[PDB]
Design a protein around this motif. Structure first.
Motif, PDB file in Angstrom:
ATOM      1  N   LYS A 129       0.812  -1.209   0.000  1.00 12.32           N
ATOM      2  CA  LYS A 129       0.000   0.000   0.000  1.00 12.32           C
ATOM      3  C   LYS A 129       0.849   1.263   0.000  1.00 12.32           C
ATOM      4  CE  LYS A 129      -3.627   0.401   2.425  1.00 12.32           C
ATOM      5  NZ  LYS A 129      -4.549   0.635   3.558  1.00 12.32           N
ATOM      6  N   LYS A 130       2.038   1.234   0.607  1.00  9.98           N
ATOM      7  CA  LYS A 130       2.944   2.369   0.460  1.00  9.98           C
ATOM      8  C   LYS A 130       3.236   2.648  -1.006  1.00  9.98           C
ATOM      9  CE  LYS A 130       3.846   4.106   4.482  1.00  9.98           C
ATOM     10  NZ  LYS A 130       4.748   3.242   5.272  1.00  9.98           N
ATOM     11  N   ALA A 131       3.569   1.605  -1.767  1.00  7.66           N
ATOM     12  CA  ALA A 131       3.818   1.796  -3.192  1.00  7.66           C
ATOM     13  C   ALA A 131       2.573   2.295  -3.913  1.00  7.66           C
ATOM     14  CB  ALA A 131       4.312   0.494  -3.824  1.00  7.66           C
ATOM     15  N   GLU A 132       1.412   1.723  -3.590  1.00  9.57           N
ATOM     16  CA  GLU A 132       0.176   2.151  -4.237  1.00  9.57           C
ATOM     17  C   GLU A 132      -0.099   3.627  -3.975  1.00  9.57           C
ATOM     18  OE1 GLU A 132      -1.739   1.217  -6.656  1.00  9.57           O
ATOM     19  OE2 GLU A 132      -2.650   3.155  -6.176  1.00  9.57           O
ATOM     20  N   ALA A 133       0.091   4.075  -2.734  1.00  9.80           N
ATOM     21  CA  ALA A 133      -0.127   5.478  -2.402  1.00  9.80           C
ATOM     22  C   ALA A 133       0.889   6.372  -3.098  1.00  9.80           C
ATOM     23  CB  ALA A 133      -0.070   5.672  -0.887  1.00  9.80           C
ATOM     24  N   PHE A 134       2.166   5.977  -3.083  1.00  5.54           N
ATOM     25  CA  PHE A 134       3.199   6.764  -3.746  1.00  5.54           C
ATOM     26  C   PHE A 134       2.931   6.933  -5.231  1.00  5.54           C
ATOM     27  CE2 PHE A 134       6.284   5.966  -0.207  1.00  5.54           C
ATOM     28  CZ  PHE A 134       6.653   7.278  -0.023  1.00  5.54           C
ATOM     29  N   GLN A 135       2.251   5.971  -5.857  1.00  2.39           N
ATOM     30  CA  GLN A 135       1.981   6.093  -7.287  1.00  2.39           C
ATOM     31  C   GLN A 135       1.214   7.371  -7.619  1.00  2.39           C
ATOM     32  OE1 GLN A 135       3.151   4.030  -9.597  1.00  2.39           O
ATOM     33  NE2 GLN A 135       2.157   5.008 -11.357  1.00  2.39           N
ATOM     34  N   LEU A 136       0.341   7.824  -6.726  1.00  4.60           N
ATOM     35  CA  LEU A 136      -0.467   9.026  -6.957  1.00  4.60           C
ATOM     36  C   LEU A 136       0.187  10.273  -6.374  1.00  4.60           C
ATOM     37  CD1 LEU A 136      -2.636   6.530  -5.763  1.00  4.60           C
ATOM     38  CD2 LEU A 136      -4.087   7.993  -7.184  1.00  4.60           C
ATOM     39  N   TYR A 137       1.436  10.535  -6.741  1.00  2.68           N
ATOM     40  CA  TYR A 137       2.163  11.720  -6.302  1.00  2.68           C
ATOM     41  C   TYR A 137       2.543  12.566  -7.506  1.00  2.68           C
ATOM     42  CZ  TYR A 137       2.607  10.499  -1.374  1.00  2.68           C
ATOM     43  OH  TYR A 137       2.355  10.239  -0.050  1.00  2.68           O
ATOM     44  N   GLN A 138       2.158  13.835  -7.475  1.00  3.90           N
ATOM     45  CA  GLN A 138       2.483  14.805  -8.505  1.00  3.90           C
ATOM     46  C   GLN A 138       3.699  15.620  -8.072  1.00  3.90           C
ATOM     47  OE1 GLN A 138       0.977  14.296 -11.236  1.00  3.90           O
ATOM     48  NE2 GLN A 138      -0.608  12.957 -10.383  1.00  3.90           N
ATOM     49  N   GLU A 139       3.982  16.688  -8.821  1.00  3.95           N
ATOM     50  CA  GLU A 139       5.133  17.527  -8.513  1.00  3.95           C
ATOM     51  C   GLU A 139       5.000  18.228  -7.168  1.00  3.95           C
ATOM     52  OE1 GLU A 139       3.310  17.446 -11.135  1.00  3.95           O
ATOM     53  OE2 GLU A 139       2.384  19.373 -11.626  1.00  3.95           O
ATOM     54  N   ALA A 140       3.778  18.571  -6.756  1.00  3.72           N
ATOM     55  CA  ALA A 140       3.588  19.224  -5.466  1.00  3.72           C
ATOM     56  C   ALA A 140       4.023  18.318  -4.323  1.00  3.72           C
ATOM     57  CB  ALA A 140       2.129  19.637  -5.298  1.00  3.72           C
ATOM     58  N   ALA A 141       3.670  17.036  -4.404  1.00  3.89           N
ATOM     59  CA  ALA A 141       4.026  16.101  -3.343  1.00  3.89           C
ATOM     60  C   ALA A 141       5.532  15.868  -3.284  1.00  3.89           C
ATOM     61  CB  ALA A 141       3.280  14.788  -3.547  1.00  3.89           C
ATOM     62  N   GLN A 142       6.182  15.726  -4.441  1.00  2.32           N
ATOM     63  CA  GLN A 142       7.631  15.572  -4.449  1.00  2.32           C
ATOM     64  C   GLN A 142       8.322  16.818  -3.918  1.00  2.32           C
ATOM     65  OE1 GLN A 142       8.302  14.592  -8.584  1.00  2.32           O
ATOM     66  NE2 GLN A 142       6.739  12.990  -8.420  1.00  2.32           N
ATOM     67  N   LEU A 143       7.803  17.999  -4.258  1.00  6.01           N
ATOM     68  CA  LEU A 143       8.329  19.236  -3.698  1.00  6.01           C
ATOM     69  C   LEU A 143       8.173  19.270  -2.186  1.00  6.01           C
ATOM     70  CD1 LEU A 143       7.693  22.702  -5.288  1.00  6.01           C
ATOM     71  CD2 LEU A 143       7.410  22.417  -2.854  1.00  6.01           C
TER      72      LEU A 143
END
Lengths: 53, 52
Positions: free
Chosen positions: B32-46
């Motif tokens: 589920k960590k991987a599943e959640a990380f899949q939905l990350y845009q530039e704002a989340a990485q920032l």
């Protein structure tokens, strides 16, 4: 003949003095070993199921 | 000696089963960590970069 009767007496005395106490000691050791083995096995089972839970 | 061997066997088997239990839990956890990380845009990485 005095010494022959002494031989018989000392044979019986050595029997009663060391031969039977040796057997009693062996029985005591094996009984206590059985008790200790059962105690250790039960404690190990308790610890194992503690770890499992 | 037999009692000691049985003790070692049982305790080791129990702790190995416990290791497997955390293994399965952690695997189902990280999926589920991987599943959640899949939905990350530039704002989340920032946000992650500026938090680190």
């Amino acid at each position: 003949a005095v010494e022959a009767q002494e031989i018989l007496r000392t044979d019986k005395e050595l029997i009663a003095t060391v031969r039977r106490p040796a057997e009693a000691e062996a029985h005591r050791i094996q009984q206590i070993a059985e008790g200790e083995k059962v105690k250790q096995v039960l404690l190990a089972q308790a610890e194992a199921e503690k770890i499992r839970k | 000696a037999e009692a000691e061997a049985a003790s070692v066997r049982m305790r080791g088997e129990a702790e190995a089963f416990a290791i497997g239990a955390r293994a399965r839990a952690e695997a189902e956890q990280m999926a589920k960590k991987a599943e959640a990380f899949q939905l990350y845009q530039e704002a989340a990485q920032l946000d992650m970069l500026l938090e680190k």
